[PDB]
Design a protein around this ligand. Structure first.
Ligand SMILES: [Fe+2]
Ligand SMILES: [Fe+2]
Ligand SMILES: [Fe+2]
Ligand SMILES: [Fe+2]
Lengths: 147, 147
């Protein structure tokens, strides 16, 4: 694989995970204000899992001799997912489902781009992808009870 | 106290803690690349403590009927501390000491501004201030062994 291209894709994924962490933290706090207990619990669980994903990505960046970009200024422009506050609980759940589906689609594209060229990095994306699918299922379950 | 002014100061402190979290996470990963084990450990411990501070601040914002601003785009402009990468270990340690001293000075100013007008919020800042003093001592201890 091209080392620089893999490092850029890892840093884009890192930005995605950090944006999703911040968005889920926002939603957790707002959900506590609505007394939406299980939604809040899922938002916080998901936030901490996104930070675990960020950690795995940054560790791989270090292993490949790159530098992980945690600068908040450019995060949104490196991330495929958006930071969106929303107003209602339904808005927040919908925005998280949108973001998880974006992350899923982006990680599938990265896995295909990598092919057989960097198996270690590929497996990291495969593991994260599987957990984003669980995140999306979690959000869909809540969203269906709000429709 | 003026509720809106207290909410703004809480959101500025929240941004400060989030910037410091991101900067310490950057430094942790770079320090692992340098095999600077105890510096890395302190950077990560400090990062997770800054996120605990952020959580306490956001919880108080919710209690006062405000909204905690986790948007990464404007974080640096709301934060008194800066996100600074540095190049060497000494640079990173120095930047964290600078940032802790900034946070300490800003939190002392906030505590004086609050006076007796919002004791709950004041005590939150007092608790965080005490831990930032410990963070600064930790960084100074490392920095002196690098001088
Ligand atoms: Fe993730
Ligand atoms: Fe996710
Ligand atoms: Fe702090
Ligand atoms: Fe600190």
């Amino acid at each position: 694989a091209d080392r620089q291209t893999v490092l850029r894709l890892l840093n884009e994924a890192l930005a995605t995970e950090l944006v999703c962490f911040l968005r889920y933290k926002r939603h957790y706090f707002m959900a506590t204000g609505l007394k939406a207990s299980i939604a809040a619990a899922e938002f916080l669980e998901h936030a901490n899992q996104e930070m675990q994903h960020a950690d795995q990505l940054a560790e791989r960046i270090m292993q490949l001799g790159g530098e992980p970009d945690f600068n908040p200024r450019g995060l949104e422009e490196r991330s495929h997912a958006e930071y969106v506050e929303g107003k209602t609980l339904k808005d927040m759940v919908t925005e998280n489902l949108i973001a998880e589906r974006i992350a899923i689609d982006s990680y599938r594209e990265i896995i295909t781009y990598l092919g057989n060229d960097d198996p270690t990095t590929r497996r990291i994306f495969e593991e994260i992808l599987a957990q984003e699918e669980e995140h999306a299922d979690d959000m869909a379950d809540i969203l269906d009870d709000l429709a």
